[PDB]
Ligand SMILES: Nc1nc2c(c(=O)[nH]1)N[C@H]1[C@@H](S)[C@@H](S)[C@@H](COP(=O)(O)OP(=O)(O)OC[C@H]3O[C@@H](n4cnc5c(=O)[nH]c(N)nc54)[C@H](O)[C@@H]3O)O[C@H]1N2
């Protein structure tokens with residue numbers, strides 16, 4: 001059937017779609033988008049796939065025995081189907097039992113993640129609002145991306161920096177001589193955004209490729225691996241041993257002292273503490289000068305190459321662009337801190353195309369905003385007019401808010417006391433947990449340790465669109481529909497604010513699935529508080545209310561038509577903006593425009609932190625050895641290979657791994673691909689296409705061989721997001737519940753360690769990992785990850 005195209009959008013971009021034979025016929029890019037992503041070929045598979053959640057289900061023994069069931073069985077995949085009313089009655093009864101027997105400290109419902117775009121249907125917000133109307137629970141602070149970075153920068157530059165707007169791309173293209181990409185791959189990571197992604201940044205990357213060819217701009221990539229960006233631009237690379245970056249920075253600062261290359265004016269007028277740091281680099285107290293000769297065998301860079309780099313950074317106007325990966329390792333606050341110190345010693349902060357950036361690889365930061373106000377959202381909290389059924393604040397002496405990544409450690413040892421960014425934290429006694437809009441069995445580390453911690457839980461509830469590993473390890477499960485099976489509203493470009501889009505319903509929700517609004521409105525009915533929850537409005541009434549409010553705010557500078565007209569058009573345009581320079585104000589007059597630090601200047605040495613007395617984070621940057629390190633680091637005698645689980649090029653974390661046809665374009669021999677170097681492959685007799693087994697003293701998995709020159713000796717890669725699918729010793733689905741079971745597909749976190757960054761931020765350290773690998777020789781199993789549950793009938 002040939003009809004008019006409809007409008008919509010997602011984290012991958014804005015689209016245009018047409019329907020035929022009652023199904024979505026085809027996807028086309030939105031007109032204004034000139035650089036779409038290849039992942040546009042996987043969209044249709046996300047809605048029509050084999051891992052779809054058909055109806056509500058409850059785990060066998062839990063259905064039969066309630067909170068007194070055999071928890072050792074989680075993971076075997078056997079479930080029983082039930083009606084919506086029965087499933088909701090059970091859910092509520094469980095919340096009753098826990099508030100009564102234990103109280104608020106025994107429930108954890110605050111985990112967040114990459115939920116789909118949409119101002120009205122946002123899943124995590126609907127769950128928390130309804131559950132709150134029942135009773136309180138435990139919350140968290142932080143995230144898995146910039147955990148350490150966001151905790152340290154406020155002390156140095158006076159802000160988190162990572163999520164702020166930066167210097168405009170044009171100003172950079174016209175003034176920068178050298179652009180340093182340190183642990184940064186923007187060509188690959190710019191394909192997605194927080195809101196509908198405009199992809200504007202790709203036009204500027206194209207202009208950059210020109211400058212590189214003409215020989216007008218020099219780009220240097222400091223990375224242990226050859227990146228996608230380096231290949232696209234045709235620029236150079238500087239190898240560095242993984243995790244040894246800090247020794248290089250210290251050596252560079254040593255050259256600048258000896259041969260007077262640092263800007264003395266900027267230091268004296270814009271910072272504090274330089275004179276307290278010098279002694280360390282110079283070795284006047286500890287006994288060792290941090291010279292290039294010293295750093296060389298550690299970082300893997302020759303003394304003369306280090307001196308050459310130093311002269312280059314002061315030769316012209318230099319612009320630093322740091323990624324996020326480097327701070328996701330043990331002591332991750334150090335490289336971020338020491339970087340800011342180098343930028344200060346150079347003294348080009350505040351100039352167009354000079355200084356340092358921590359985010360030009362995220363949601364098109366660098367393209368100027370229109371200046372318009374964006375639309376509001378559905379509330380995730382109770383309204384001033386209401387109260388919950390219970391409402392107790394007794395946490396039995398424990399903390400009501402914990403560091404995001406310490407949640408497993410708390411289930412394992414309640415009542416323990418930990419240090420945390422200048423305060424004390426006490427772990428609560430958790431018995432029940434709720435998940436919506438996130439996938440814990442993908443994002444956390446150490447699968448086999450997580451299995452032991454789960455044995456101590458009484459109830460686990462999950463709402464998702466597909467049968468993910470998290471659902472596989474739950475007690476009650478509820479089905480939701482995709483954004484293409486409902487109506488919503490969203491802004492175009494998280495930082496651009498180019499306009500406002502319309503997310504129109506394409507087809508009817510499949511099977512027994514429901515929209516997140518519907519799911520929690522029914523729950524509110526059980527509690528007898530339906531109207532209060534919804535504010536007495538439906539889907540379209542809510543959307544119309546949010547548009548009108550946005551139009552009200554923008555009344556002064558932007559014109560907008562009425563809702564009826566807007567919906568028919570499917571889009572409303574805002575405009576372009578003017579260029580801007582990041583730290584120009586503080587530069588012009590630091591007396592008038594100080595920073596948010598305690599003194600108002602840049603702090604190379606902080607009195608505040610030094611006062612804490614922490615052993616693994618002191619008054620100034622230092623080099624400290626890690627627990628597991630390659631190329632001569634501790635532990636490389638038994639497990640020589642470094643494992644990096646860098647973000648995927650053809651997925652958004654775990655989202656899209658379910659798209660059948662599209663996935664089969666990169667899968668190898670049924671498994672997820674492992675990228676291996678020629679030298680290491682030869683030493684083990686491995687060839688392309690062979691099934692490989694990667695392991696260590698904590699876990700084991702299977703994967704497909706891919707030999708590549710982009711990987712140096714001693715390093716392998718397996719992308720984060722590959723679905724966890726364990727099997728027994730006989731290759732069965734059910735045996736997958738066993739502690740120590742082999743993963744038939746290849747999830748990297750099956751081999752990772754659960755450690756805290758340092759006493760300062762207590763964040764994720766996933767990249768500190770050592771392993772070993774061999775050619776798999778045993779009976780080959782079938783993948784259990786994508787085929788859904790075993791249905792048991794009573
Ligand atoms: N080893 C290693 N570990 C890492 C990382 C690493 O570099 N290495 N990187 C990490 C970071 S940066 C982050 S962002 C993280 C990602 O996991 P996550 O947030 O759960 O998103 P996700 O994985 O995409 O899963 C989101 C789930 O949400 C569901 N969903 C999405 N939208 C909807 C919706 O509208 N309603 C409902 N009911 N659910 C919805 C998805 O189906 C998915 O299962 O994993 C970190 N961990």
Ligand SMILES: Nc1nc2c(c(=O)[nH]1)N[C@H]1[C@@H](S)[C@@H](S)[C@@H](COP(=O)(O)OP(=O)(O)OC[C@H]3O[C@@H](n4cnc5c(=O)[nH]c(N)nc54)[C@H](O)[C@@H]3O)O[C@H]1N2
Nearest residue numbers: 145183184189222223243323324325646647648651652653
């Ligand atoms: N296509 C796609 N886009 C996305 C995402 C996605 O899932 N898919 N997710 C997004 C979110 S969640 C966030 S957190 C972000 C990821 O940033 P980042 O960790 O820096 O990318 P990274 O790729 O994990 O790492 C970048 C580089 O860091 C190098 N590296 C890693 N460790 C070190 C080290 O110690 N020393 C040095 N010098 N460099 C190191 C890596 O080689 C990689 O090139 O990317 C978003 N964009």
